[PDB]
């Protein structure tokens, strides 16, 4: 589909058996979701945005579905104010910027 940017590009994602709303963010290196439980091992990581850094848990090889498109990748979990889908997963669903 073609998503305009008049409003924030929010979409529904399916992860860990849960349905969440997330922001398609081309300015995000990684994908970070609000506090939730995920299977497997994890490693701590510090990620920085405007305002500074926050500590998150890093889970690798996590299955996720965005707008019907299945993908696998690293998912960070921590105190983010909004669910963000970053470039690591946007590439997998074939998302591109056009103008």
Catalytic residue annotation: 25
Residue 67: partners with Cβ closer than 8 Å, 6 or more residues away: 1, 11, 12, 93
Q: Is 80 in the site for its own copies (CB under 8 A)?
A: yes
Q: Is 79 in the site for ligand 2AH (CB under 6 A)?
A: no
Distance in angstroms (rounded) separating the CA atoms of residues 30 and 47: 9
In contact, 83 and 20? CB cutoff 8 Å: yes
Q: How far is the CB of 37 from ligand 2AH (least distance, A)?
A: 19
Helix (H) or strand (E) holding 72: strand 69-77
From 27-35, 58-66, 67-75, 91-99, give the range in contact with ligand 2AH by CB under 6 A: 27-35
C-beta closer to ligand 2AH: residue 19 or 50: 50
Binding site for ligand 2AH (CB under 6 A): 23, 25, 27-30, 32, 47-50, 81-82, 84, 86
């Amino acid at each position: 589909p073609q998503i305009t940017l008049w409003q924030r590009p929010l979409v529904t994602i399916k992860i860990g058996g849960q349905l969440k709303e997330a922001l398609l963010d081309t300015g995000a290196d990684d994908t970070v979701l609000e506090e939730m439980s995920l299977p497997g091992r994890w490693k701590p990581k510090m990620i920085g945005g405007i305002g500074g850094f926050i500590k998150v848990r890093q889970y690798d090889q996590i299955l996720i579905e965005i707008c019907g498109h299945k993908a696998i990748g690293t998912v960070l979990v921590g105190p983010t104010p909004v669910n963000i889908i970053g470039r690591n997963l946007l590439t997998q669903i074939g998302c591109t910027l056009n103008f």
